[model samples]
Target: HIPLPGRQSPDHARAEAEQLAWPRSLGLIRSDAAAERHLRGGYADLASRFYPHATGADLDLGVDLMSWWFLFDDLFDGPRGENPEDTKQLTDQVAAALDGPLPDTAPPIAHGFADIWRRTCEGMTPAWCARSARHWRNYFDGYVDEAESRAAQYLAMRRHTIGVQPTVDLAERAGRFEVPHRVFDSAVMSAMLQIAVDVNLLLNDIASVSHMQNEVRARLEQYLLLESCLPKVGEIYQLDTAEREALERYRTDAVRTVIRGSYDWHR
Candidate 1:
């Protein structure tokens, strides 16, 4: 069974909480109504749950980063999203912000993204930087195609465009732990990762009134099955104690925190 998600104290630095205003200042949000929508969206609260173990200072990082993603994603809900070329242009700007400097003339979204990437990747490793950039590319790449035909094949495509994977990657930074490539890439770990994502994505579908009653139930079964084998991953990989701890931390954060935390948020 999953442990209940724990949260850091509600108060973060006022300046940190005020970071919400940065997006508004950039015109990323259209108006007071939109700003209120984001604030009430309670995504900062969602970050608190998702990164429960983050330090008081790091919690600010998590909250601001989460707010940026939700805000950036909302742009796709409007007429701007009707054009595939525009979608690709916007996607490319964010992608470039990951590794390159943005000029003052860059779009507001790109400027916003450049700031976040600089802060987020500051203390991370080159390996992490590489992996994170790859995840971002795959996520961004999904936008144009989705704006076009959209495909699978179905679940496979959803896995990319859904944007859960990179957030899970960020959970590593929030928790101050990084799972190495071998252990993270293992069949066991990837299965657990997918189950966590599948659960949340299906929850979104269900909210849209889509039996997910059974779909979710099957994934839950697979989750428990995968959890049972996680210990075996440590054994098979010959993981050291530190490596094992990394493994457990990823499992707990991804499943115990993220999956359950999201359910509570949607409610």
Candidate 2:
């Protein structure tokens, strides 16, 4: 069975659900009802509980971000995702929203991303902003790559795939790590993060395998929980243990929390 942390209050989860209105205010959804349904389906409550340390504005922002990105998966990895050309066009628009101004007439999705981009920019350094944007661009590129994989019906042998890095990269941005690049960019850190991504991907696929092929599952499972996955839970503390510990009192618990959070989210 998948692991889980101690239960969070239902009252708290519902209170956090109010943040769904943030996206509604941004015109990301038509109404409060639509926003609530989407949040419930996306299991935003599970995420809220997972990030127990987040509160106030940070909590609200996290909920809204989670809602949008999951909805993005539906749009990007669903029917429209199968066509590489169409996917490129869609991502091109999103890229514009992320990098430059979007017209008032742009699709609501574009506007929503632009809003998020603006807010995130305020919280991050210029260098961090660039790094976050690069990862987001890579995320879009990975969508196109997955479309190709669907068409070919075969995935080549590689150390990592589209499914891996994007999720891991997003964790930093969404978690608001906000540290300098040199700090977290190391071989051990990369390995640790990649494993976390793999586990998250597996949990996601477990919930609904439609987005991935069984062949992909086989390859992923072969390397599950390797040595690389277990090391360096504490390494991150070296940079700023106090800040990191505030998020998770212990590194091992933090890693488990992520794994269990994804599992409970899927279940």
Candidate 3:
């Protein structure tokens, strides 16, 4: 339902990502037909929703990163998918790129990751850097080998692979300022963000299996209750009016928009 770019038209952003053009030159997607298929994934539009106000270079990074994620994730669909060694090595290369530098011998995928990861972390804070790395690490771990658990454990696995955490961090990058390290990690705020993650995850599940899905309702109730606690976060931190407004806007727009927009992507 939300098909338009979040802010600036993607015409310029598209070239920044180079969309299929970038990937094809890297040899990631060979042939015109394959290139067309990647373009049709609608990643740029989805990136727009994730960072609705972003435009110009910032918008370009969002689209490019989303474009990169899809291309990387799809690699797991084939023969090397379950080969832990193959998957591990490749994911580690990207993490290495994120952490700092990649060796000259690094492959095209790793080099591509270095490019985006560098741009992604630029101008971000140290706390943001650590948090983003952790999310990406967990994501890499998820693909290394799958897992199981009582449903809670299953959810632990599901949450990371959903890869929403880094996207959330990127949302901060797309915006002008951030919520601050301590505030974002606080109990109340953490719970709210977790709800955001679970909510989107539920939406994704419903696309595969329709709901009464009592599970969906349970999380929904938790969301309403926990969201109310956000005011206390502002009080505890002694935040001014503008900062509080930023927090609420983050939930309503940056967080909520992506959650809703992501469901649109799923459909």
Candidate 4:
């Protein structure tokens, strides 16, 4: 069992997640009351508890984004997930909606994702905006790849999952720091941040293994070695004490919170 951070608390963030502004803004209203209610519940405070250090507004955006992705996942992966062409079309629409002007007529998913994209851009530097934007595009491409896999069935092409870069980038963006490009853009920083994401992904795969077969987990030894060598690597990059400390926390308890929370969420 992973150990939770003693300092973690989701009380205020959970309260923030429960606020109605974002959900209502996305048009999650009276229709389909049950689905609305479930969405309103806000992914069991996954963002709040995991990113326990985030400000209320940061938590709000992160939680709203989480809720939006859940809806998007359900929409794509439900009945419509198997159709490659249709899935690609939907992905194109969603990616276009990220920075483009909102369509006169858009679905709740588009509305929600677009809103988060705007707010996320507002919070981050242009560097991160470009960074996250590219990451998101890659993510859309992953969905298209998944659609192709479904269509091919027993075909020869190999399928791979999206890696942890976007997840790590989003966490940094959601934290709302005005990080410098030298520090934030370094490969070392990405490698450090990826450790936490690896843990979360590992647990998520474990929890979903019943439906998903033979999912190859990442090597624990690599993670351990990379983690052990981070301090030396950070020295080369000249990460200050505060930055180093935060990175350590993020890689450890913050990640474990996600692991335990994912299990609790499924259980």
Q: Top model by TM-score, which number?
A: 1
Which segments of candidate 1 are over 4 A away from where they belong?
Answer: 1-19, 24-31, 150-153, 208-210
Judged by lDDT relative to the true structure, which candidate is superior, 2 or 3? 3
User: What TM-scores do the predictions have?
Assistant: 0.88, 0.70, 0.85, 0.74
Residue-wise C-alpha lDDT for candidate 2, range 1-267, written one tens digit per residue: 332345443345654647566667776778667766785675467546555545555555556666667666677656677778888887788778766898787777777777777766676668867876777777777667767645333323121333344333333444566433543465544544555565565555444544555543443443344323423543554545554443333223334445555666666
Worst 10 residues of 3 by lDDT: 1-10
Which 10 consecutive positions of candidate 4 have the poorest summed lDDT? 154-163
User: Could you tell me how far off, in angstroms, the CA of residue 39 lies in candidate 4 after the best superposition?
Assistant: 5.4
Q: Residue 15: error of model 2 in Å?
A: 4.2
* CA lDDT of every candidate: 0.75, 0.56, 0.72, 0.60
Which should have the higher lDDT, number 2 or number 4?
A: 4
Candidate 4's TM-score reads: 0.74
RMSD of each: 2.9, 5.6, 3.8, 4.9
The better-scoring model by lDDT among 3 and 4 is 3
Model 3: residues >4 Å from true position, as ranges?
1-18, 24-27, 147-150, 206-212
Between candidates 1 and 4, the one scoring higher on TM-score is 1
* Model 1 lDDT at residue 206: 57
> What is the alpha-carbon lDDT of model 4 when measured against the actual structure?
0.60
